[PDB]
Write a protein that binds this ligand. Structure first.
Ligand SMILES: C[C@@H](c1oc(=O)c2ccccc2c1-c1ccccc1)n1nc(-c2cc(O)cc(F)c2)c2c(N)ncnc21
Length: 834
């Protein structure tokens, strides 16, 4: 009880927000959730395997791609086992496991040791086939030797968890719901007339709307009006958001209040809600009141209480085939609902079905629940992630509807959970209530696997550190996680948090003071002062928790000559068993919002996985990136890489030959050089298709880079998000491919061919990409997120069009880029002057 004060204070340090704080609330939902999440934590902690949790092996049940089979020699796998600076090689089959492989070593010169990967904290352990380990595939994909160091396993005791110590409406009537608007109050006015618009909302649909009369916008406006709504109290659905907004027209302020609380009670009493200052985005839905009580506006209220016909089946099937953004007419909705039992047979009909429910009626919602009660077809259906994701977006409130979504995610293996985790963390923003099946899914999955747990922490910490709209909720979830992750990890997270808090301090202090002599001088002094006392011996790399970064390579650290002034920092590896002498690189940056970088890079990983399922590898580089705080964070330095603008600038006269010449120098042999040119054709093709689909194609060439081995890759997506070519394919790139102006070439034929395959590949997962894009814009990018902005990707994916018309579309977009040529790239420098 005296010791728990320090532990709670330790948890507040890791979260960067006090969950015991009660200044910004009008109920106990957050405290109820803190208590509510105890059971799921303690359940999952009680059921987890200690040794497997300790070693967390990164394995899969998905097949090896048709591309990766060619790198197997003679059904053989060369593992290089190390032990005390003395190595040995072993012949291994693809279906072998570590236990069989260890017994082979002991024969050639028992069950105490474990086979750990060289460089990383990663363990080839368990009863998984050696073909289906992620690390075995990294070494096959990159073309590397599978190196592993024999040593003792990590002791489970280190991962000990601390001991802990702790339907319908009530007041139900056929009365019409009403709220008295007493008045509003702000200390300073920021536009002479104003009025309150009150809205009964369920899942971003206005069930009923009433307004006050207009009045002069003075510092204290008092209407004292009862607004009677049409909707009856018994007809209020759970999760019904009372949304209050101030207009002048122009929406200036907004706040929300849940009409039915976490204990199923109707909301009643005097409330003084502090509002947010200002098209739909996730912030607009929040149950959170404004914490800035001094400067913010406040509203004050009072609550006192047979077989189907042929044509129609075909008509219904037509509705079910359409894209997620395809509008349902009131005719369509009436059809879907009337034949809801037929609609229930088709899992793909579900989003549209539950979008056809009149959530303003108790009889209907009752019927909808009776319908969901018999879901044999839903449970037996093969997991569709895109379908599951629809049902967790802003259009669906209602626990049961969202619950069957989460029910399908349960089947995802750990590998697939990481792929979708960020989006799923963001989807918590669309939850009406703090405690939710989704929140509990995340917590559970985080506690079961350290890798998922690691990235959960940081994704949660990102939003806690900068979203006032949702910091309160996410913190109660992260506190819940950290209370079961283990003492080993809590110490590990603390190390990382303390390293980051140092390194951001140097970044911002140097940002205050193009490059000069004193800036180069002061940095090398600043990094020495931290390394000599403050900074640890070693710490986990947040963007990659296999790597333990050691000391600073102070020689290699430097500041960019840019307005934003990022810190390029470089670390030696703390692991002595690491194969090379190569450094772990990091870019700390203030000024950009790196949550936009996060979300784009995460879709690129999803695009790779899609491409893997249809045996394609377009050679993307989705480097590590983690947002740590407000306009601040961290990026993985991609090694042996330059910007294509530096290659050129060595005014604004761009040159066709130079990139091709640049590859000839950094690659010694021709067969390497051609291998670079090959890698360029894929990488360039993949980044063209991906950026077209995401609407972020038109980049200026400072924000496009290439590796010495010809791997093209884009950067700085946060910069862009906030005459026009569809994607960067400047002449310099085409010159590597052996074509100039009108001409064609054998690599350029291969470019168009892959681009077409990839594009059509992504189009086989249209719905998934539509929702990822939809949810990105709503949760990630406040700047632009209207109906038309979401509907960009429809036109990009050529929805409702066959593979021939679609092929023609993308090839024409390639022809545009050439027809304009250097035009746009030159126009950036021209715009700096103009
Ligand atoms: C532009 C370049 C760069 O960025 C610095 O910060 C920097 C700092 C001190 C000196 C040179 C630099 C350079 C640099 C410029 C020209 C040639 C070589 C290096 N850059 N930028 C990102 C990068 C990517 C993001 O998504 C977000 C972000 F904020 C930065 C990046 C990366 N991930 N990997 C490798 N290089 C990278």
């Amino acid at each position: 009880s005296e010791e728990s004060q320090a532990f709670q204070r330790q948890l507040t340090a890791l979260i960067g927000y006090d969950v015991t704080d009660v200044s910004n609330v009008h109920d106990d939902e957050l405290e109820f959730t803190r208590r509510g999440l105890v059971t799921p934590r303690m359940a999952e902690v009680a059921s987890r395997d200690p040794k497997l949790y300790a070693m967390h092996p990164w394995v899969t049940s998905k097949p090896l791609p048709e591309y990766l089979w060619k790198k197997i020699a003679n059904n053989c796998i060369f593992i290089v086992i190390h032990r005390s600076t003395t190595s040995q090689t072993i012949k291994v089959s693809p279906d072998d496991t570590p236990g069989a492989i260890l017994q082979s070593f002991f024969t050639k010169m028992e069950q105490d040791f474990v086979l750990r990967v060289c460089g990383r904290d990663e363990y080839l352990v368990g009863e998984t086939p050696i073909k289906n380990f992620q690390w075995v595939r990294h070494c096959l994909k990159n073309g590397e030797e599978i190196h592993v160091v024999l040593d003792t396993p990590p002791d489970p005791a280190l991962d000990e968890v601390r001991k802990e110590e702790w339907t319908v409406s009530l007041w139900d009537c056929d009365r019409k719901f009403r709220v008295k608007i007493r008045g509003i109050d702000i200390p300073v006015l920021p536009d002479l007339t104003v009025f309150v618009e009150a809205n009964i909302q369920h899942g971003q649909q206005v069930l009923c709307q009433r307004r006050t009369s207009p009045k002069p916008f003075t510092e204290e406006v008092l209407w004292n009006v009862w607004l009677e709504f049409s909707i009856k109290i018994k007809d209020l659905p759970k999760g019904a958001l009372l949304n209050l907004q101030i207009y002048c027209v122009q929406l200036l302020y907004y706040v929300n209040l849940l009409l039915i609380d976490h204990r199923f009670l109707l909301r009643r009493g005097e409330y003084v809600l502090h509002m947010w200052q200002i098209s739909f985005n996730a912030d607009k839905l929040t149950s959170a009141t404004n914490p800035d009580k001094e400067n913010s506006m406040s509203i004050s209220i009072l609550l006192d209480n047979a077989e189907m016909p042929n044509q129609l089946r075909k008509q219904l099937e037509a509705i079910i085939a359409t894209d997620p953004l395809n509008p349902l007419t009131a005719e369509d909705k009436e059809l879907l609902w009337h034949f809801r039992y037929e609609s229930l047979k088709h899992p793909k009909a579900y989003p549209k079905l539950f979008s056809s429910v009149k959530w303003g009626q108790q009889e209907i919602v009752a019927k909808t629940y009776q319908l969901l009660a018999r879901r044999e077809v839903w449970d037996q259906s093969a997991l569709d992630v895109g379908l599951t994701m629809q049902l967790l977006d802003c259009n669906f409130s209602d626990e049961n509807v969202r619950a069957i979504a989460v029910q399908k995610l349960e089947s995802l293996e750990d590998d697939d959970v990481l792929h979708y985790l960020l989006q799923l963390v963001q989807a918590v923003k669309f939850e009406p209530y703090h405690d939710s099946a989704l929140a509990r899914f995340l917590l559970k999955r985080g506690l079961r696997n350290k890798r998922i747990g690691h990235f959960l922490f940081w994704f949660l910490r990102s939003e806690i550190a900068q979203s006032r709209h949702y910091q309160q909720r996410f913190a109660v979830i992260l506190e819940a996680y950290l209370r079961g992750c283990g003492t080993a990890m809590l110490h590990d997270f603390t190390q990382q948090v303390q390293v980051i808090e140092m390194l951001q301090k140097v970044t911002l202090d140097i940002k205050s003071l193009d490059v000069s002599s004193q800036v180069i001088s002061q940095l090398k002094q600043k990094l020495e002062n931290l390394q000599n006392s403050q900074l640890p011996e070693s710490f986990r790399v947040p963007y990659d928790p296999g790597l333990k970064a050691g000391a600073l390579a102070i020689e290699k650290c430097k500041v960019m000559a840019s307005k934003k002034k990022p810190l390029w920092l470089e670390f030696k590896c703390a692991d002595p068993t690491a194969l090379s002498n190569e450094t772990i690189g990091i870019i700390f940056k203030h000024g950009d919002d790196l949550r936009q970088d996060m979300l784009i890079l995460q879709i690129l990983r999803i695009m790779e996985s899609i491409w893997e399922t249809e045996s394609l590898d377009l050679c993307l580089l989705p480097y590590g990136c983690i947002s740590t705080g407000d306009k601040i964070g961290m990026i993985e330095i991609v090694k042996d890489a330059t910007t294509i603008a530096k290659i050129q600038q060595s005014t604004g006269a761009f040159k066709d030959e130079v990139l091709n010449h640049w590859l000839k120098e950094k690659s010694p042999t021709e067969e390497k050089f051609q291998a670079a040119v090959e890698r360029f054709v894929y990488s360039c093709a993949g980044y063209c298709v991906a950026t077209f689909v995401l609407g972020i194609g038109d980049r200026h060439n400072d924000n496009i880079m290439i590796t010495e081995t010809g791997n093209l890759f884009h950067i700085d997506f946060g910069h862009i998000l906030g005459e026009r070519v569809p994607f960067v394919l400047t002449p310099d790139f085409l010159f590597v491919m052996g074509t100039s102006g009108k001409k064609t070439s054998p690599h350029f034929q291969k470019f168009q061919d892959i681009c077409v395959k990839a594009y059509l590949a992504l189009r086989h997962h249209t719905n998934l990409l539509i929702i990822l894009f939809s949810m990105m814009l709503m949760t990630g990018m406040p700047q632009l997120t209207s109906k038309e902005d979401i509907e960009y990707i429809r036109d990009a994916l050529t929805v409702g069009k066959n593979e021939e018309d679609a092929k023609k579309y993308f090839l024409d977009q390639i022809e545009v880029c050439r027809d304009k040529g250097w035009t746009v790239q030159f126009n950036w420098f021209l715009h700096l002057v103009l």
